[PDB]
Amino acid sequence: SHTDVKVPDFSDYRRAEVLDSTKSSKESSEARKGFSYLVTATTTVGVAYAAKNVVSQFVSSMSASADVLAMSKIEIKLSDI
Amino acid sequence: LVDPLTTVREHCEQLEKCVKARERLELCDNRVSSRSQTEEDCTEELFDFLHARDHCVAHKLFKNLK
Amino acid sequence: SDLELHPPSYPWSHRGLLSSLDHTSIRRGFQVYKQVCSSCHSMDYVAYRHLVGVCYTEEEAKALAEEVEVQDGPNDDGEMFMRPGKLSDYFPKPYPNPEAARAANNGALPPDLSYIVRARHGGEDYVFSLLTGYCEPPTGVSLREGLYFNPYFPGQAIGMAPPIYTEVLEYDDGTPATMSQVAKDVATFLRWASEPEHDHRKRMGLKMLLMMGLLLPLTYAMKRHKWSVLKSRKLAYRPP
Amino acid sequence: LSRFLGPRYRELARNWIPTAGMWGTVGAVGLVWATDWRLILDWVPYINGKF
Amino acid sequence: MTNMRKTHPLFKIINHSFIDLPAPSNISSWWNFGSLLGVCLMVQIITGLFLAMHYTSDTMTAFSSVTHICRDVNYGWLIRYMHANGASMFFICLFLHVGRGLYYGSYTFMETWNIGVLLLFAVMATAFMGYVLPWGQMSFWGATVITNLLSAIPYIGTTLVEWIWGGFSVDKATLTRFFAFHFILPFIIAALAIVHLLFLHETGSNNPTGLNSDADKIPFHPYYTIKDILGILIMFLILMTLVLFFPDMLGDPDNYMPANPLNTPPHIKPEWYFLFAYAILRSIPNKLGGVLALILSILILALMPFLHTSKQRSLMFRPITQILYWILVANLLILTWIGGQPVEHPFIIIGQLASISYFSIILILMPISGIIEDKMLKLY
Amino acid sequence: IWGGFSVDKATLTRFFAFHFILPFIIAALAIVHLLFLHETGSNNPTGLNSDADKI
Amino acid sequence: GREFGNLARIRHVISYSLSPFEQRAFPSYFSKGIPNVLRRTRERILRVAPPFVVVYLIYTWGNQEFEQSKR
Amino acid sequence: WLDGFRKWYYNAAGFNKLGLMRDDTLHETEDVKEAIRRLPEDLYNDRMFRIKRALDLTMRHQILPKDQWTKYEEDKFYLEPYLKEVIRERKEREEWAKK
Amino acid sequence: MVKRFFESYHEVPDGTQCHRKTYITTALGGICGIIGSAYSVSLNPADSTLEAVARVGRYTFTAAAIGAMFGLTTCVSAQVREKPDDPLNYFIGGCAGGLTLGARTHSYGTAAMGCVYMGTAAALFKIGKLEGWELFPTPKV
Amino acid sequence: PTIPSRLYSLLFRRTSTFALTIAVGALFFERAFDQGADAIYEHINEGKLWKHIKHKYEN
Numbered sequence A: 001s002h003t004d005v006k007v008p009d010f011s012d013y014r015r016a017e018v019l020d021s022t023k024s025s026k027e028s029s030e031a032r033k034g035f036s037y038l039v040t041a042t043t044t045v046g047v048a049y050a051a052k053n054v055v056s057q058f059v060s061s062m063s064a065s066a067d068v069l070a071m072s073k074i075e076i077k078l079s080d081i
Numbered sequence B: 001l002v003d004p005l006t007t008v009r010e011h012c013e014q015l016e017k018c019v020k021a022r023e024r025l026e027l028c029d030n031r032v033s034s035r036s037q038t039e040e041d042c043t044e045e046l047f048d049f050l051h052a053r054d055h056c057v058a059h060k061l062f063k064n065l066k
Numbered sequence C: 001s002d003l004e005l006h007p008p009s010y011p012w013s014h015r016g017l018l019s020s021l022d023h024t025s026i027r028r029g030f031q032v033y034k035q036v037c038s039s040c041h042s043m044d045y046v047a048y049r050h051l052v053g054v055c056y057t058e059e060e061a062k063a064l065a066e067e068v069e070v071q072d073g074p075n076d077d078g079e080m081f082m083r084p085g086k087l088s089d090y091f092p093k094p095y096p097n098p099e100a101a102r103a104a105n106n107g108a109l110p111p112d113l114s115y116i117v118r119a120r121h122g123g124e125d126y127v128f129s130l131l132t133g134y135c136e137p138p139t140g141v142s143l144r145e146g147l148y149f150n151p152y153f154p155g156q157a158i159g160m161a162p163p164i165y166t167e168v169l170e171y172d173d174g175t176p177a178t179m180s181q182v183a184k185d186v187a188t189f190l191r192w193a194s195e196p197e198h199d200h201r202k203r204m205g206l207k208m209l210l211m212m213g214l215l216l217p218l219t220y221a222m223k224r225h226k227w228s229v230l231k232s233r234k235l236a237y238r239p240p
Numbered sequence D: 001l002s003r004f005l006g007p008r009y010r011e012l013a014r015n016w017i018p019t020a021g022m023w024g025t026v027g028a029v030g031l032v033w034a035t036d037w038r039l040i041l042d043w044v045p046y047i048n049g050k051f
Numbered sequence E: 001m002t003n004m005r006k007t008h009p010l011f012k013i014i015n016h017s018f019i020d021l022p023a024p025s026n027i028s029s030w031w032n033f034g035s036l037l038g039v040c041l042m043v044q045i046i047t048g049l050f051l052a053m054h055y056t057s058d059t060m061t062a063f064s065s066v067t068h069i070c071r072d073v074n075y076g077w078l079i080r081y082m083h084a085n086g087a088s089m090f091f092i093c094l095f096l097h098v099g100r101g102l103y104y105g106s107y108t109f110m111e112t113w114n115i116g117v118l119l120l121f122a123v124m125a126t127a128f129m130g131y132v133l134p135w136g137q138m139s140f141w142g143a144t145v146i147t148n149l150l151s152a153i154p155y156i157g158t159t160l161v162e163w164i165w166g167g168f169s170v171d172k173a174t175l176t177r178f179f180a181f182h183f184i185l186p187f188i189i190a191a192l193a194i195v196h197l198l199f200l201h202e203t204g205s206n207n208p209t210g211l212n213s214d215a216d217k218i219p220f221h222p223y224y225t226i227k228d229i230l231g232i233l234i235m236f237l238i239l240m241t242l243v244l245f246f247p248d249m250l251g252d253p254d255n256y257m258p259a260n261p262l263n264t265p266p267h268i269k270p271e272w273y274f275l276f277a278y279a280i281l282r283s284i285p286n287k288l289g290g291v292l293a294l295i296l297s298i299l300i301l302a303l304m305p306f307l308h309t310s311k312q313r314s315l316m317f318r319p320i321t322q323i324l325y326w327i328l329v330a331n332l333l334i335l336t337w338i339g340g341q342p343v344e345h346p347f348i349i350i351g352q353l354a355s356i357s358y359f360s361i362i363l364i365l366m367p368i369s370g371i372i373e374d375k376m377l378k379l380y
Numbered sequence F: 001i002w003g004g005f006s007v008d009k010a011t012l013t014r015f016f017a018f019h020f021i022l023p024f025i026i027a028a029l030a031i032v033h034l035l036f037l038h039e040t041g042s043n044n045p046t047g048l049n050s051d052a053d054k055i
Numbered sequence G: 001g002r003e004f005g006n007l008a009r010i011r012h013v014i015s016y017s018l019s020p021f022e023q024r025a026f027p028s029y030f031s032k033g034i035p036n037v038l039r040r041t042r043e044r045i046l047r048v049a050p051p052f053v054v055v056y057l058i059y060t061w062g063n064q065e066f067e068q069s070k071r
Numbered sequence H: 001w002l003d004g005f006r007k008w009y010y011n012a013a014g015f016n017k018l019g020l021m022r023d024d025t026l027h028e029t030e031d032v033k034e035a036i037r038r039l040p041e042d043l044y045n046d047r048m049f050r051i052k053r054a055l056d057l058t059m060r061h062q063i064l065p066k067d068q069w070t071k072y073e074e075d076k077f078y079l080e081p082y083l084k085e086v087i088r089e090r091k092e093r094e095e096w097a098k099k
Numbered sequence I: 001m002v003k004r005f006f007e008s009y010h011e012v013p014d015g016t017q018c019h020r021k022t023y024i025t026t027a028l029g030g031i032c033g034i035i036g037s038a039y040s041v042s043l044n045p046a047d048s049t050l051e052a053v054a055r056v057g058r059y060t061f062t063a064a065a066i067g068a069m070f071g072l073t074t075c076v077s078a079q080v081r082e083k084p085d086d087p088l089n090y091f092i093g094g095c096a097g098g099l100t101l102g103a104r105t106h107s108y109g110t111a112a113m114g115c116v117y118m119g120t121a122a123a124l125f126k127i128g129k130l131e132g133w134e135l136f137p138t139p140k141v
Numbered sequence J: 001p002t003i004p005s006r007l008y009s010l011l012f013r014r015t016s017t018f019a020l021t022i023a024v025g026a027l028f029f030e031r032a033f034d035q036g037a038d039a040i041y042e043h044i045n046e047g048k049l050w051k052h053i054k055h056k057y058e059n
């Protein structure tokens, strides 16, 4: 027929707060979304720390070299004159 | 006037493989002393003796050798 | 004598994957390099600027720079005049030409000491064992005039003296100046002159290793979280 | 290959012999004119002298 | 009111190529290597941007400019060793991409494969032609050996090698020539990769199983961009392990002297992605046969569209064609070791036997292997 | 953008690298210039939607 | 692979899929993963393994035979 | 012995473990795609179900258990009376093109 | 010449020359499989000549694979440890030969028992060659 | 309610607050990772870096 089909058991795949069918959802959906979004935020803060690091390495590479910073600094006034 | 690191001499008087390399090296020394105007020499046996000597004083004597 | 000897894996202070060099031994190696090896060998790509931040203070590096009279140009009347060195100039070449270096060292060129450890296979263990390998030659091996035998140089004929022994320098840091200590000090100093980025390199490697250890299972969990729809996708087939 | 070998394809290849051979001489004469070969340009009497 | 990713035309081609491209769901980690080659080409381009800003191209101070980058330029050592080990990362991703292409039945994407081997020729040319540019003894003598082996052809050989040299040997015009070529070539490699993606997107991607994947399709976003990010993070793990821990391990230590034409290294050796090329060139005793074996060795995997005698597409359901493919990559590893070894009896007979067996696998034994697959599975 | 206290060697090599790389950015921008042109069509001197008379 | 709607003409096939947020991200990662890696390596280690030990035998043969011949 | 070697080759090919018979793992050429147009509808439907289930199984990198593997004696050669007709029609078309 | 061929195993020390070593123990496993399959044919007769030749080929191939995997893993452990006078280098090879035995007879418990028994047999063989008192002694008292 | 449930109910629901917490975590995490990794790098290398010798051998 048309309602012969039932969705099978996902009990070997379901997360630990949504195993029970006697309890309802929207009581641990905040936790089960906030865990994966904490993983999303900490993955994105790893990507953001790498992006704030490597672009700063490249910007300090476009900045002045140690030979030029050693050459341009020597305004030694002395005490001879 | 201080002494150098004599753990090369301590290794080669403590280990059997170093005096085996020493005895085959002096056998080749007597061979090239008996044979005059020869092309063979003691280079490969002194190479193996130096390799065993420096490998042991690198890998098992490290309390002063860096 | 076309065979070359591989140097043994010496247990250095920086041979480990996360251990930097001994900066005190870098200072000792620069001191005994300036004593005995800098009068013949010529390095060029290192300077007195690079010693500060690693082994010396700025006043100590200025006092090391001012003791050498290096050549600049030109004098205002139109000639060449001498000045004391500063931190900006590079190292004093003791031979002004490579052909003058070969004519002073009998036809043997002293190579560029700034890149020896990266330049040679085996690393600084070769540079330690070449200086500590000055043994007597075996019989059946005869050499030239003024030429001494090493087992570590390819070709088995160095163009050198036996340059270091016990009491080369009255050593200012209090360590005894034996030959293995002096050769270890110039080997880690030439490793520093070859790779001055060793401390920052393994520091950035530590940041990278802790960052990938705290980032890669999160990215793997994000791949599994965005792919767990397909991992839990079960099909069916119901024809009528 | 096996479908391309036949009497009709041999007759089509015979029909396409002179224009493809003339295009091959076009490519050869153009390669000679582009590279200026000293063996070949010294045989043409209009460029006989030194160029 | 309207969708921007199907209305705006740059966003339309970005959405069609990147967002909801119909891709098969069953592709493995070996399918990530094409986008890994794209981001590795982009990181080679951006490290070359930040590397050529302090690089002076002339033989008096090319090596002095390289040491000025590695010492006096702030974070210049990271850029130069990241560029060299990212060339190594680029070639190991290219070798795993072409191993996936030889494995998983994707010979038959014919124009994709032909513009791929044109791209592979350009990548190898720009890799050697940028390996000259540090101007060491090994780089100069490798330039002399590789360009001198192109002089084996009569009547065009010495004209070609003074054309590619600008003199009797490698000199200042040769180094500035190779630096201009090393600038211009990866951008035409990137445009060739863009039209390689266009020739892919004509007919979609393929599965590991060699089947028509039109029944089961997932969008590329967000199912494959997070696998792209995971592949990018593991590729950056191995690349940053290569730059920050073992910088000269995959490189040659003999390059780090100043270049001198008056002496020769005791064995002359090109880079690790050119070692099988140098072993195939060293296998043939005739020099013209060696350079013809070079060109035929790079070009002979473009004949693999024409060497598909089997009615099954992939090698997933071909068990002794898998045996011949793994003995092909074993021959490639033996070729890499033989090219790393110098020219001595008996490395030459091992290189000769391994090059003969590699050409017998890529030409003879694998089409008759596909014939005996379809004979053992009763197709005819 | 100077790389130092004045215009110098690093400024000249950096401007060499930028001057080499920027026409390929101009070529890719010309490709997307053609791509944004080819859906909206091309103008005429009369200034009309001229889809009836097209060659 | 032209577009995402006119590709196939399939019929009578039903696909159930759960959420990313209603299920575990690592569902039995060890007890169903290490038998799966063991089954995949059991399927392909007899095809990927003996060419590489031929490579290692040729490598040790070449190194010890070159060091024997260079005496 | 030849049937035992063919069954060992069927086990070593791997698509009996994965859920496909002999005629699903064909290269989709123009002859095979003409036969794809020329199957009946039920055979086409469970063939594309078997290809979709095989793509699901090689996405999950796992196979079915041994009780529901496609046996060599349970293999049917459904595409072969269509593919042989397409091959002989293409052969007579190329012979008429040679004529 | 068979015994002079088979005594090339011992005068070359472990850690070097793995190809000749695995050829000697592959030939030893093939000879022991030939005599074990001859005993299996003369104990249980096959129903066909094709079944008997498949039985002797299968037993010779499995015992040659046991000997080849034993000597290959013994020399691979000798390469990775560089200890030629070590019975653990024969323990790993005997366990790999027993695992090859149990993989060929398709039972993991038999693989574990073959690992334990063939590993202690190879360890007793290498340590009996190390001390030197013979398995087959001359009568001396 | 647990701590990711309160974090989603007050903090992770809005995407701008999500990016705000990502950037605030970057601002704290740069200094925290620099301090922790420099503490690890000078804990495993006592007496070898310049910071353990500049306090006593600078003059």
Ligand code: HEC
Pocket: C036, C037, C039, C040, C041, C105, C108, C109, C110, C111, C116, C120, C127, C130, C131, C153, C157, C158, C159, C160, C161, C163, C164, C186
């Ligand atoms: C007489 C001047 C002189 C002195 C003093 C000297 N060297 Fe040398 N050195 C040379 C020459 C000349 C060569 C190369 C030719 C040869 O092999 O004889 C050389 C070779 C070397 C090499 C080998 C590089 C290679 O590529 O093989 C190293 C390393 C080296 N010296 C370091 C040192 C160190 C460290 C010292 C200080 C203990 C030192 N040298 C003392 C002149 C000198």
Ligand code: HEM
Pocket: E030, E031, E032, E033, E034, E035, E037, E038, E041, E094, E097, E098, E100, E101, E106, E107, E109, E112, E113, E116, E117, E119, E120, E193, E196, E197, E200, E205, E206
């Ligand atoms: C080095 C630059 C290269 C880049 C950037 C590149 C890029 C890509 C991309 C993006 C894909 C699609 C995979 C995906 O996104 O999931 C792909 C697939 C493909 N590429 Fe490349 N490719 C490169 C080199 C090559 C070469 C040299 C060849 C020829 C041997 C080649 C042949 C193929 C083939 C046949 C496919 C289709 C099969 C598959 O998806 O794996 N590619 N490439």
Ligand code: HEM
Pocket: E041, E044, E045, E046, E047, E048, E049, E051, E052, E055, E066, E080, E083, E084, E086, E087, E090, E123, E124, E126, E127, E130, E131, E132, E133, E134, E182, E183, E184, E185, E186, E187, E255
């Ligand atoms: C268009 C982008 C690129 C630019 C501008 C560029 C620029 C440079 C420059 C200036 C150098 C010399 C500095 C040095 O010694 O490392 C160099 C070296 C090199 N490049 Fe590139 N490059 C580019 C892309 C690539 C690519 C795609 C590859 C890989 C095939 C590559 C491989 C190399 C190699 C192997 C070296 C030598 C590294 C060494 O020995 O130091 N480059 N490149």
